[PDB]
């Protein structure tokens, strides 16, 4: 189960920020 | 006003203060 750390920590570190900042950027610039 | 109510309550608090000081000074045990 320890292997989940190798999946989740990179996701919370990179995937989640990129996805969140990408969406929020597109939302705050929507006209 | 003559300030009877507030002086009465202030005296009561100052009485308690003195009563606790009487315990402190071993006057009342």
């Amino acid at each position: 189960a320890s292997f989940l750390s190798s999946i989740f920590v990179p996701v919370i570190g990179w995937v989640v920020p990129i996805a969140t900042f990408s969406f929020l950027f597109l939302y705050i610039e929507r006209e | 006003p003559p300030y009877t109510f507030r002086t009465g309550w202030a005296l009561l608090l100052l009485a308690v203060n003195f009563l606790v000081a009487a315990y402190y000074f071993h006057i009342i045990q």
Partner: protein
């Protein structure tokens, strides 16, 4: 004209980067949202409160799950005084092998963080013995968080949105929250302690599988109904009792022993059971006071508006006009939020002061870092809640307070002599400040000149009297509980001081933090804390009572809570808003908790090392604090890493420097103000436009320097974050380093 923020057409039409910043700052300020009504405000707030509860239960679930999965709970059970509790696993790609080796600790197979939250102690005390139990706790708390999230959604749906009248039904909520949320919660916990924790404490496994079959007491609820209640106090746990084993265990479920369990050095579970049972009955009684739907009960509006004391006419409750106070409280959410932040802030300090001196969790008194962490944590929270109480009190005065509705009452009178209140606060602050700094500086100079016998050392004789009145015979005063002749000690008629034997054993042992011996060092620092509390109050009260206006800005209520200034006219009006008092107060709030936590920590470090002398002799001059506390206890922390290698304190060493950096960064926003930056950003905008390949790309939002208020927010945040991380690092590294 961009969509975001949806709640402000003013911000949505801002063409600059200020649009983005002010949307973040105003997102949760629902009153300030466009087309917000009172009913929609309460209904959104209620739904949001379900969201916050869910977050707390998901946070709580995380603690259980991560300890169940990655912790050493089952190992820690077997030796709680020597095993280090694990918080969670470390998975950091950036670690070198030396760091991985350094963080491989507490008998873990990989790198882990040691837990300093005292959750292991708490969970062990309340009867959890297996990772499976912790896991089941975590999955339950996910489902419990899930239930509140759904409730939040449901109570926004058309049919299930409560009316404004429902939200303003104060007396019904007071009955339900006192009797139900407090009273039954307390009774239910008393149930848990009696049915599970106390059996588990006596080596008896009681869980969901067998709790219906196994009776908490041999007598089995027959004495309760027949009223032979004393049966439940018969045969308490002995002084020989070894926690979580039958060796020396009793059968009593409701005792009243007083003092501590001698092995665990924590409050008896059977005392804590009887406490929560007694507390429950008192709260259930209290929540039958207010009228709801059955005629009987007190009306709080009637009590406030009452003008007759048994025929004799009075101005109101205690002959004080409280008319319109019920409506003021009930109608203003900022009045409530402020008032409830004050109460919670007091209770948080209360908890902190009591949890160190009267530990409830088995073996936590000997986990010195956890005790230090938990005291500092709750004192910092208390300080924020207290500043918030006054902040929202100022927001109430500037946004909600109706002078006409509060005509002639206690609140109008307080505002009438606000100059007298603020001037006397100014005096107490100055009076404390001059003489306290005076005595420290006197002491610091006479010690520096090699004459420490010339120090002004004041015995805290009034506090020492209270310790003696609680039966601490060290001082040799022989008064109240230290006098075995006193009616207090004997309880002359009834002689039912059954608490006292246990209490006197606890207070007269020097092996605990129950009424620590105090001297000149404790006197000077209590007077520094008083100075701290009065000056933070002075800033916040002045901020609150001048929120609506002052001589300098008579129409201040027209400009609201937060605004930069009223410009350089009339001599200059920087930091004139009520918000700017909150901003200034938090520096003092942090300064004050600094003095409180430094004092707590240095006194305890002495006690823990069996070297109280160090504090007792060196705490009377500020070089003693500087050298024997800050300098001395930085030694191990700052060697967390060095040229020679790393140890487990490398993370605290790095966080220590991080705190120092974030604090210092805050000074930039607090010292250098907007006009400098706006002129600098103008040249950057020029350069971008004129750079030949870069001018390809263009901003959607015009770059502007942060606002005057935003800079105070950002500055104060960096300062605060810096303050907390710096001390957290030092507090933990210095204690965990020694212990």
């Amino acid at each position: 004209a961009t969509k975001f923020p949806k709640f402000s057409q003013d911000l949505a039409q801002d063409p600059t980067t200020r649009r983005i910043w002010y949307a973040m700052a105003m997102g949760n300020d629902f009153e300030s949202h466009d087309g917000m009504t009172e009913e929609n405000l309460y209904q959104k707030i209620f739904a949001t409160h379900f969201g916050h509860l869910a977050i707390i239960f998901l946070w709580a679930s995380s603690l259980l799950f991560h300890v169940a999965w990655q912790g050493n709970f089952e190992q820690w059970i077997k030796d709680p005084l020597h095993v280090r509790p694990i918080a969670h696993a470390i998975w950091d790609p950036h670690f070198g092998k030396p760091a991985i080796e350094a963080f491989t600790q507490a008998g873990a197979n990989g790198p882990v963080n040691i837990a300093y939250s005292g959750v292991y102690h708490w969970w062990y005390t309340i009867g959890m013995r297996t990772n499976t139990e912790l896991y089941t706790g975590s999955v339950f708390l996910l489902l419990f968080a899930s239930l509140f999230l759904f409730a939040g959604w449901l109570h926004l749906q058309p049919k299930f949105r409560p009316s404004l009248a429902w939200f303003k039904s104060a007396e019904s909520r007071l009955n339900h929250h006192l009797a139900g949320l407090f009273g039954v919660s307390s009774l239910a916990w008393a149930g848990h302690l009696i049915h599970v924790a106390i059996p588990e404490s006596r080596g008896q496994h009681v869980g969901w599988d067998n709790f219906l079959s196994t009776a908490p007491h041999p007598a089995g609820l027959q004495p309760f109904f027949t009223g032979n209640w004393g049966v439940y106090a018969q045969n308490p746990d002995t002084a020989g009792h070894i926690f979580s084993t039958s060796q020396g265990a009793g059968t009593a479920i409701l005792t009243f022993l007083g003092g501590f369990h001698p092995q665990t050095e924590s409050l008896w579970l059977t005392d804590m059971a009887h406490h929560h049972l007694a507390i429950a009955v008192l709260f259930i009684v209290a929540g039958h006071m207010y009228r709801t739907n059955f005629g009987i009960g007190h009306s709080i509006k009637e009590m406030m508006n009452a003008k007759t004391f048994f025929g004799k006419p009075v101005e109101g409750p205690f002959n004080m006009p409280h008319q319109g106070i019920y409506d003021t409280y009930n109608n203003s959410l900022h009045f409530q939020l402020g008032w409830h932040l004050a109460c919670l802030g007091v209770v948080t300090s209360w908890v902190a002061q009591h949890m160190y001196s009267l530990p409830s969790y088995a073996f936590i008194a000997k986990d010195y870092t956890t005790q230090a962490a938990l005291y500092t944590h709750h004192q910092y929270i208390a300080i924020f809640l207290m500043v918030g109480a006054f902040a929202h009190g100022a927001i109430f005065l500037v946004r909600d307070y109706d002078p006409e509705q509060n005509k002639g009452n206690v609140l109008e009178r307080v505002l009438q002599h606000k100059e007298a209140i603020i001037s006397h606060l100014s005096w107490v602050s100055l009076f404390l400040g001059f003489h306290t700094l005076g005595l420290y500086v006197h002491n610091d100079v006479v010690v520096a000149f090699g004459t420490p016998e010339k120090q002004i050392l004041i015995e805290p004789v009034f506090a020492q009297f209270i310790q003696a009145a609680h039966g601490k015979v060290l001082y040799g005063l022989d008064t109240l509980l230290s006098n075995p002749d006193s009616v207090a000690y004997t309880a002359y008629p009834n002689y039912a001081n059954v608490w006292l034997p246990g209490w006197l054993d606890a207070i007269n042992s020097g092996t605990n933090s129950l009424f620590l011996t105090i001297g000149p060092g404790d006197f000077l620092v209590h007077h520094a804390i008083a100075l701290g509390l009065h000056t933070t109050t002075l800033i916040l009260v002045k901020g609150a009572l001048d929120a609506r206006g002052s001589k300098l800005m008579p129409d201040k209520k027209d400009f609201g809570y937060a605004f930069p200034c009223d410009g350089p006219g009339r001599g200059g009006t920087c930091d004139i808003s009520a918000w700017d008092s909150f901003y200034l107060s938090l520096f003092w709030a942090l300064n004050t908790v600094g003095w409180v936590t430094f004092y707590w920590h240095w006194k305890h470090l002495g006690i823990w090392q069996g070297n109280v002398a160090q504090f007792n002799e060196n705490s009377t001059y500020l070089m003693g604090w500087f050298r024997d506390y800050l300098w001395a206890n930085s030694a191990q922390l700052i060697n967390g890493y060095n040229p020679y290698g790393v140890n487990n304190l490398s993370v605290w060493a790095w966080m220590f420097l991080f705190g120092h950096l974030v604090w210092a960064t805050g000074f930039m926003f607090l010292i250098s103000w907007r006009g400098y930056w706006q002129e600098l950003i103008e040249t950057l905008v020029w350069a971008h436009e004129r750079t030949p390949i870069a001018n390809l790309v263009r901003w959607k939002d015009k770059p502007v320097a942060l606002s005057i208020v935003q800079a105070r927010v950002v500055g104060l945040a960096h300062f605060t974050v810096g303050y907390v991380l710096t001390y957290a690092a030092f507090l933990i590294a210095s204690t965990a380093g020694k212990f």
